[PDB]
Amino acid sequence: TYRLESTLNYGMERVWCVASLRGSNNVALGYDEGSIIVKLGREEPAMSMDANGKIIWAKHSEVQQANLKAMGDTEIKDGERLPLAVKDMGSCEIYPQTIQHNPNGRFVVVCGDGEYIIYTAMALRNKSF
Amino acid sequence: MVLLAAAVCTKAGKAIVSRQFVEMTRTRIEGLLAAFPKLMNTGKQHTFVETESVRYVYQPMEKLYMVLITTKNSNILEDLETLRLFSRVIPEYCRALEENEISEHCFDLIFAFDEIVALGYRENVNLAQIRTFTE
Amino acid sequence: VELIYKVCHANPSERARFIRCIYNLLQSSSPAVKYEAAGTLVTLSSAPTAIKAAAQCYIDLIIKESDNNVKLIVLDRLVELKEHPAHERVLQDLVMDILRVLSTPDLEVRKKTLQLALDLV
Amino acid sequence: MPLRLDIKRKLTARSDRVKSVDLHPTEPWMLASLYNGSVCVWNHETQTLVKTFEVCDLPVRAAKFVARKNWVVTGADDMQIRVFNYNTLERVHMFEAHSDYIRCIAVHPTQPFILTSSDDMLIKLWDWDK
């Protein structure tokens, strides 16, 4: 939407170049008075596993970022990574800064922008705010 | 002494300038430096390499070797650290290493060697400290 | 004057003595898992494949101490990286597969690696 | 619009105008090419400066690592791209990349190629292996 995420100055000024790491989350920027290597955020995912087998994440595959979904009912061998095993989950209204299922499975919480919205475990109707 | 000599070498097959703290390694200094630093101190691009039962620590600069030699040792960090401080002091005198310019500032380098390592025990030096002496 | 009662108290000097002092207080079946020895040790074979090959050897040794028959030579400690639970995720054996080699890494590392597959299992 | 960010200053270094900044293709080091005639690289995880190379005495606009050869390519106002070994510290090769100073270099790890872009309005290709 090209809306300003941040403006950064440093007391180095005149920023000539940019480049980005191809494996991602470091960008480095060349200035008149020096160079800086900078580290960008998001290093880790937000998700939670309840007891209903709705393990909910945001982003990823068979889930959108804006909406909320995910399920994981698979128990295949401990030695490898298990499939996504997602089942579809209803409405959301906010972005997931952190998105989490209830630890015993009755609530879902999506948190975002100074607000939390509560959606119901497997029905996803707005429970609470 | 723990540190036999502190030596700047050219791998022309001779010790270009060198320091004998107390009279021991005179002529001896040149033969060691001349043979061993030619082979990269017999190194493989490793700072510590030991040959003919003498520990050689080094750094290549051009056709020249800045060399520290010991045949005994008190600590790991220390041997490198005197060499390192030496490597701050040497381009102030000679603008990198190079046999003719090393040759011309025998006095400068030699004096630093006495100051840096005294009776084989690694003292410390710095480019400002060096100034008071050659003033 | 060396040997401290402490962990340290600070600075490279104290730190260098300290790994010597640690090897004393646990000599038993090599260091196993190398202490502060690891830092100098890489430079000791800067030419270049020989470090990995060596590193691979230690990592294999460390996994387990097996029976130690003909080319089953893994020393160090018996349990410290186990071998072979069926609930362990994503398992020990993944690292063990590297050691089985056709050349899968380069030849110096290869010769070390084939012996090392034989050695753990 | 919201996004998971957290800007952090991993390492800084002060030097005369750095035209190019790079991350090492496979290593945790970042190389910055400066107008000191020097290119300098620092590994901004352990905060150790791994090595410096004096490409020219006039600005080095570009620098990049050709990680496989264990070499770094630089292009400076010598109108040359000079190549050095970043562990055996010596100049691997010297060549005239262009008729003018070299603003940027791009490295193809899968091919022997670097193409360099210069302000002689031309981009030229060089093959490190030849």
Phi-psi region of C52 (alpha: psi -120 to 50; beta: other; left: phi over 0): alpha
CB atoms A34 and D12 under 8 Å = yes
Q: Is C58 helix (H, G, I), strand (E, B) or coil?
A: helix
Task: Spell out which chain B residues touch chain D, with contact meaning CB-CB distance below 8 angstroms.
Answer: 45, 60
Q: Quick one: CA dihedral D120, D123, D127, D128, positive or negative?
A: positive
Experimental method: cryo-EM
From residue C30, alpha-carbon distances to C27, C40, C83, C99, D90 in Å are: 6, 17, 20, 22, 39
- Residues A5 and A42: their CA atoms lie apart, in Å, by 14
**Cα of A12 vs its chain's centroid, Å:** 33
Measured between beta carbons, the chain D residues lying within 8 angstroms of A6 are 5, 7
Contacts of B124 (CB under 8 A, 6+ apart): B82, B85, B116
Question: Considering only CB atoms, which chain D residues are within 8 Å of A42?
Answer: 3-6
Tokens of A107: 């609530």
Tokens at residue B85, please? Answer: 């401080």
Contact D99, D85 (CB under 8 A): no
Is residue D15 a contact partner of residue D32, using CB atoms and an 8 Å limit?
A: yes
Instruction: Give the C-alpha separation, A33 to D16, whole Å.
Output: 6
Tokens of D63: 């620098």
Give the span between the Cα atoms of D5 and D24, in whole angstroms: 23
| Omega of the bond leading into C79 within 30 degrees of 0 (cis) | no
Which whole-number Å values give the CA distances from B25 to B70, B83, B122, in the listed order? 12, 19, 18
Q: Tokens 């791009």 belong to which residue?
A: D106
Of B47, B13, B46, residue with least CA distance to B32: B13
Cα distances from C51 to residues A115, B87, C57, C58, C108, in angstroms, run 53, 28, 10, 11, 10
Chains A and C touch, using 3 or more CB pairs below 8 Å: yes
D17 and A30: CB-CB below 8 Å?
A: yes
For residue B46, give the nearest of C12, C13, C43 by CB distance: C43
Q: Give the residue from D52, D89, D91 with the most B CB atoms within 10 Å of its CB, the best one to mutate.
A: D89
Are B86 and B78 in contact by the 8 Å Cβ rule? The answer is no
In order of A100, B57, B65, B86, the CA distances from B111 in angstroms are: 70, 20, 19, 11
D55 neighbors D74 (Cβ within 8 angstroms): yes
Header resolution in angstroms:
13.0
Query: At CB < 8 Å, which residues of chain A contact C?
Result: 78-81
CA angle, A32 then D51 then D49, to 5° = 70
**Helix or strand holding residue C15 (H, E):** helix C12-24
Q: Can you point out the beta strands (E) in B11-125?
A: 14-20, 48-51, 54-61, 64-70, 117-118, 121-122
Q: In what order do the strands lie in the sheet with B5-10?
A: B14-20, B5-10, B64-70, B54-61, B48-51
Chain pair A-C, CB pairs under 8 angstroms: 11
Q: Are residues D53 and D78 in contact, defined by beta-carbon separation less than 8 angstroms? A: no
